[PDB]
Amino acid sequence: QTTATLNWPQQGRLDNVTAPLISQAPLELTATVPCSVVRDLPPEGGLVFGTAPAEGRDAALNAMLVNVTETRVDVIVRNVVVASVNRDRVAGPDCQRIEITSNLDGTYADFVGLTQISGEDAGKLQRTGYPDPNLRPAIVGVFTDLTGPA
Partner 1 sequence: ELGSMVKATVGRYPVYTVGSANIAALRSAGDSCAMADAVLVEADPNEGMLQPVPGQRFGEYGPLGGEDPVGFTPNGVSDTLEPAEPVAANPGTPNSDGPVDKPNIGIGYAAGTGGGYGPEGVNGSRVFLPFGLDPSRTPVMGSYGENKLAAKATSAWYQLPPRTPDRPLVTVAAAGAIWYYEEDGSFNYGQSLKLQWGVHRPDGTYQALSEVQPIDIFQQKAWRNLRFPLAWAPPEANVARIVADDPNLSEDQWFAFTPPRVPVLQTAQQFLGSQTPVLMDIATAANFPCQRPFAERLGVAELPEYRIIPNFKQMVVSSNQWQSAADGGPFLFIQALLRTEAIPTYLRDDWYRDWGSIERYIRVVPQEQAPTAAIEEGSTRVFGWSRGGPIRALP
Cβ-based neighbours of 131, under 8 Å, separated by 6 or more? 105, 106
Task: Give the residue with the Cβ less far from partner 1, 81 or 125.
Answer: 81
Q: Nearest distance from residue 71's CB to partner 1, in Å?
A: 11
Q: Does 80 bind partner 1 (CB under 8 A)?
A: yes
Which one among 35, 64, 76, 138 touches partner 1, defined by CB under 8 A? 76
Count CA atoms closer than 13 A to 2's CA, side-chain side: 0
Binding flag, residue 134, partner 1 (CB under 8 A): no
15-23, 78-86, 92-100, 125-133 -> range binding partner 1 (CB under 8 A)? 78-86
User: Least separation, in Å, of the C-beta of 64 and partner 1?
Assistant: 13
Of the two residues 11 and 44, which places its CB atom closer to partner 1 in the complex? 44
CA-based nearest residue to 28, from 127, 81, 92, 101: 101
> In terms of Cα–Cα distance, which of 11, 35, 13 is closest to 149?
13
Residues 6+ apart with CB under 8 A from 79: 60, 61
Q: Give Cα 140 distance to the centre of its chain.
A: 15
Size of the site for partner 1 (CB under 8 A): 6
Residue from 2, 7, 79, 147 that binds partner 1 (CB under 8 A)?
Answer: 79
Binding site for partner 1 (CB under 8 A): 60-61, 76, 79-81
